[PDB]
Design a protein around this nucleic acid. Structure first.
Ligand SMILES: Nc1ncnc2c1ncn2[C@@H]1O[C@H](COP(=O)(O)OP(=O)(O)O)[C@@H](O)[C@H]1O
Ligand SMILES: [Mg+2]
Ligand SMILES: [Mg+2]
Ligand SMILES: [Mg+2]
Lengths: 312, 50, 313, 309, 312, 312, 312, 48
DNA sequence: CTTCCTCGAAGGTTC
DNA sequence: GAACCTTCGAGGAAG
């Protein structure tokens, strides 16, 4: 597989990687299970990969499932019963399961036992089941989406974040050897700068640039070739996609920078309003190209000069 | 009696009476407790994977 | 031609067409199938025909189905056996497929095999079925609701766009040769200008003008006949119908450009709220003649200079 | 009968009527079926009537159904299996069909075949050339793909005083009631531009002449009958006149809000907005404003008050 | 009985009563069914009572149902086809019928036929069901809630008006003979002038006076008993309730006549904004005691001369 | 018990009791059911309690339900079928019923029948249910939400007033006799003045004082123990809370009595804009501590002496 | 275990403990349940723990659930039928309970009965359920958000506040003693000052510091180690979280210090309004970092001198 | 062959087919000796 | 998918 | 120019 197997191989995330090393080894000295851990952050940063690294460092076999895969308490209780001391359970999209399940997860996490109440009408009894010690790992895209009482049970937080140019260049250079591709240290930097911090975007661009170099060139990805290929893919030198450029161009030419409402903008370009606000605005906001106001979105001065228009 | 207790526990977890009975009826151990039966009726129905 | 065999014959879509040409040729230089492709765009531009051309370029057999027609995992798995090595599978409206099937497609797309799990406990077993290499081509209108795992499998994204006047004119010309009518190049441009950039609307106008030219004329579509036909119909030189023109005039003449509410505007033109909001209002926004605001619709400067009225801030 | 049978009997609608004649004549000359036609517009203008006229001019038998009567895909599959070459299918209130039925119908319109599943089994049909005619009041409620399949769009418009005058005279001959030329004009002015209202007023006047007169409609009986019904010469009802009067005499012409005006006349808020105001706004007696509504100069002149800007 | 049965007994509504007499008599000379009639207007003015009078004067059977009872097209299709030639169908609260059901009447009222789906599977058929001549009658308080294509199909419209003091006095005297009580003519006028113009309120006051006259008196209603009974109920000689008087007094003594906002006045009387605007304010405006303006409510001179203050 | 059972036990509401007595006695002489009656007014003044008193004075089996319990018309029809002649049906919170169900009572209250659709669906028809004579009693906190046609059908309207100190003092004494606690008249008057005129509040304060008086007292509620206990609860001798005291003080110490706007003052007290207007301002205006004016609100002289500042 | 079980073990909240002791003790001489109690205040202060203490002092069983978990009235009825006499029911987040559900508690709390419709079709009937005596304990952050009908039925109100340094320091020393650990007095004081006055945070930080001292230290916590450990985490030298930093770093740069509305700020920082409104804003306000103004919040000079900007 | 026959029927049910239809579908196949993969492949192919 | 209704913006008067 | 009051318009959530 392309994903790393140990912290020595895992590139980037120095903060998260440094913290987990201390917490993992401290648990070994006491010969006890690691505390419940929550990983969160933008998609594609390596959350799923990190879960396997933790299990390998602990020396346990990982168990994996997902939010939509669990639908009734019997599902979770069955999975929990089939555990061995120290087993690690990974639940992706932990925030999407039904609340009827959360009612049981609380005591499982905190008490390591469940007590199934049973009876009808006046009758009421319960049976308690012991659970072997386990470590839960959850992952989400946002921290606040998680249930407030559930979030309080996670004793370790892991905030993932975008990679920097040095780390992405090391990733780009490595992957190229798997394809038997010759890439210069300069070309690998251009692709890195334009991948906007996401490892799978860089890998997806590299696969596409390879095809161009094998036809419009001599199979060597040069700086001169990568620049021609990236303009053929319609990827801006700031990493703006085809749709990203369409949004900014429309605001400047048709509305003088706004303000403009989401409904008007989403109808001018043939897009669904749920797409614009979820996929594209988050990047343009963090990078400072668009700002939100009660009257609508506005194109900042930075955006005006990048697109190449005379500012007011 | 532990059979009905085990079936009653599986009913609370959301299994239908037919399946809970069929699940528990597959298990048989006169000395087992409803708790040790419960931990078997589910283990016998989950698909283990490697 | 209307039914194109190769990219050399497909009219328009030069951006997506140029990109696919390089990817197909690079794939042909190796004994590999083309990467999974996803097509985006508004409804009615021709995505179905584009998939057929891709198969002819690769020299492969094409299978065609749709998202709604697949109800259970067995439906998809049975179709995959029908594929020969390198076949193309086209799925329309891929966003409507039920999740029970979606989770089976991941392993098939990534590994070209499917694993079926059966039994329980100590009897748990799995059977492994190999699949021949294939290229999945998906098309969707609502790209924003595909799950992230599915989008991660697709390696090529293509965006369709509305046709421009130099290309939409050729579709009229070519279509005029399917019927038996001569059309002057100057007249073909007048129909394209009003076709809103959509091939379906261009065909409809030509049919209505054809009927007029053979009942009110000599059976030839000259500029003089086109002028009369486009005068019987209400469509103006920008493609605005009669009702479109009445809306813009009313806002400028009675409300001074707005803001004006949807209900107040509806009762003035004697139409239902749903009719103005869904039939007429969507195109006026794309054309840049009106904006929607927290307080109501407002006419823009571009609308004033088109209707011919003085404008003031 | 009351419903005209041919274009020579269909008074008015010169725009839609002129266009339909060109398209119908061209289709016959080629021995082809007519394109799919959509008819839409306000209530009572002639949509349902025109559907039967089209069939009589084409010389075909009209198959008729309605939207509310179709509830499942199996219903439409049964109906379409009865069509013969050149048949015309008319669906009234087409905006009510379920979404699952629309997808089936717009497929047949394009490719003339059906391939659907209906214990489940497939159904496949090959359809002959046919024309679908739809009539609706809520065209904006139809899906965007379906509206694109129709090749002809007919939008109905209100009638003029010369046209309505002729309709009143025509209907009078069916009831075999004698009416004078100037008396027929008095019913036209008050009919608000709609044929159904013109026919309604004629019925109410006929009933009066048979009891309070000599059974003949004349310029004197009509004036008495219209005084009993209390319909103004502009067509304003008693309640419509009370609104304008209250605005001019208690609020100096406005602006005033909808809530204040409703409570002052002892009427329900929803009734004033949806039943009485729409005609007053289209005739130009009232204006809506960001701060309320105001009576225009036309209202002052009609009610007989001194206007002040 | 408490409801009149013929036009000889139905007091008032001269405008509506005059029209119906002419149309009913003309319909008999032609020996044909009466056109469809819609009755609407304020509550308690005689809408339901008139529906029975029409049937008795036409001399036909009356079939009765209500809007809240019908919920699906199958229910209406069952009421139809149970009609005989010349039957009258009366629907009360017709504004409640679902819109998908009203669209079934469009064909029935205009052409006396409906389209039905019959058979099953391959045997399914669409057949015309044809109805005999009949008269639909509807009564509603919310006429503006009916669809425009339905209101256009009714051929006769009756709008009800409030009654005058001469008519209400006669109604009180009539009702006083259904029960067994003697009432002086000058006392009946005293109750009528306090009944706000509504027959149902005039009957309610009489019932409350009767209870007092037989417990606190000799069983007869006279000016002396009426004044005492009306003092217990605390109804002003103009019909103003206890809370109505409190509103005017507060406006004249604290705010000098206004302008004052609805909120400020509600809090001063310990009421709640929704009760004042919906129960009490409507009658005060319709009777000229209060005037609504952009700045707030204002008390008119008529209120000053009623409460006894000086219109300074 | 806490709830009175007969008019002899029900203190206060003289205006309502006097009327209800006459109407109940007159109904008995005629051997008829009581007219439908609607009870409304502020919360906690005795509406629910009075409904039980009426049943005991009439001497019949009270049948009880609630507005929010009736989910659909099928439920209401089932309830009405269980009625026996003369039964009383009580519906608390009658304003919570849905409009589609409220319109079913229109026929039941005036004509004692219901139109119901019956049959499998192949064959179905309407039928008249005929109800026995019965009395409907409704209770609501906001009559302004009931539709005009429903409110007009109730024949007896009772509006609940606030209690005065003489009457409210007797309620505190009566309640102590049930708890067997000795309370001196000097202390009973102190509890009454702080109860804001509401019986529910008076009973609550007495319970809390009783607990304190028996854990750190001699078991007698004397004039000294009551003051100490109320000091712990932080209830001013006018019933103001700390929040209210902060408001009145702020207007004097930072604004010299105002006028000050609601938005400006809200910031100075860390209170939400609408909370202050909905929760705390109403009682301060009714007691005369604050006065609304066209330019803002002003603290009156009464508020000065209550806080001890120098009025100017 | 960490969670206290008796009042002698519950540190702080002196104002609340004193009241609860008297009421609980008085409720033990008499044989009755405790009056319904409402606990409100900032999250994480220990109100759930207080419910366990009450149950242990009363000597009864405690059942726990939450508002958002109850979807329909039938769910709450099933729960109420599962309580034995004198049991305690704890409902958290009670302010988000649906309106259709809350309407059931009004009768349960006041009289212990519920009116319910049971059966279906012809079997539908009304039943008068009866409940055994029980004590409801409700916890909410937004006391002012409760409806007037519900807030008036609680008999005891408890306001909880942030702990001071003498209290938090004792909690850290206690917790560091349950684990076999040693902490110097200077370290425990610094660790408390960094803990936002909130016990939930102080306990979580102590665990992570212990892990650091075991692997990267000599197994003993000293001021030098605590400063380093807390510097490896994002905890600022005065407890500001990374989220707190982003808020302050945003108000000064994107809005020039304000005033700015919290609504638009939330969407610009990519955070849920409730989290910033209930977990972050209260601390920054009570500590002078943010101040309220009619137009919105503004950053104070203390914030500028903390982040290192110039208060120009 | 009953081992493969039972597997093929059970696997086909896992694909969402009903237990009844899966038994019939497999019973319609001719060759018993071929492994479950061939049997399941033919079952799906024949139903297309 | 639909009907109701509540939250917000802004025009206008007055001090 | 700070404070009150009336009016309209677009969302959204409870059937
Ligand atoms: N390049 C083109 N040349 C000729 N006709 C075209 C072209 N693009 C679209 N059309 C026409 O427009 C319609 C496109 O339909 P279709 O291909 O099904 O659209 P989509 O697949 O995008 O839904 C057809 O009538 C087709 O003939
Ligand atoms: Mg029609
Ligand atoms: Mg009635
Ligand atoms: Mg009550």
């Amino acid at each position: 597989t392309l994903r790393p197997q140990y912290f020595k191989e895992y590139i980037g995330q120095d903060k998260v990687k440094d913290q987990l090393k201390i917490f993992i080894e401290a648990a070994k000295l006491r010969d006890e299970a690691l505390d419940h851990t929550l990983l969160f952050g933008p998609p594609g940063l390596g959350k799923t990969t990190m879960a396997f690294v933790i299990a390998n460092e602990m020396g346990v076999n990982l168990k994996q499932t997902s939010g939509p895969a669990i639908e009734k308490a019997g599902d979770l209780v069955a999975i929990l019963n089939d555990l061995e001391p120290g087993d690690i359970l990974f639940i992706d999209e932990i925030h999407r399961m039904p609340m009827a399940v959360e009612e049981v997860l609380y005591s499982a996490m905190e008490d390591y036992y469940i007590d199934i109440m049973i009876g009808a009408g006046e009758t009421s009894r319960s049976v308690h089941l012991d659970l072997p010690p386990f470590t839960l790992v959850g992952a989400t895209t946002r921290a606040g989406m998680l249930s407030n009482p559930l979030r309080a049970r996670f004793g370790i937080n892991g905030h993932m974040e975008y990679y920097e140019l040095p780390d992405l260049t090391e990733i780009v250079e490595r992957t190229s050897e798997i394809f038997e591709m010759t890439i210069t240290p300069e070309a690998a930097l251009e692709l890195a700068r334009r991948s906007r911090g996401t490892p799978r975007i860089a890998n997806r661009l590299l696969k596409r640039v390879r095809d161009y170099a094998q036809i419009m060139g001599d199979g060597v990805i040069d700086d001169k070739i990568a620049d021609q290929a990236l303009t053929m893919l319609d990827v801006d030198h700031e990493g703006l996609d085809y749709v990203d450029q369409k949004i900014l161009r429309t605001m400047i030419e048709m509305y003088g920078g706004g303000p403009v409402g989401l409904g008007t903008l989403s109808v001018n370009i043939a897009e669904e309003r749920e797409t614009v606000e979820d996929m594209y605005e988050p990047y343009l906001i963090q990078k400072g190209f668009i700002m939100r106001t009660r009257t609508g979105r506005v194109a900042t001065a930075k955006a005006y000069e990048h697109m190449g228009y005379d500012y007011t | 009696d532990a059979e009905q207790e085990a079936v009653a526990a599986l009913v609370a977890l959301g299994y239908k009476p037919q399946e809970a009975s069929r699940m528990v009826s597959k298990i048989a151990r006169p000395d087992a407790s409803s708790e040790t039966l419960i931990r078997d009726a589910l283990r016998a129905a989950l698909h283990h994977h490697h």
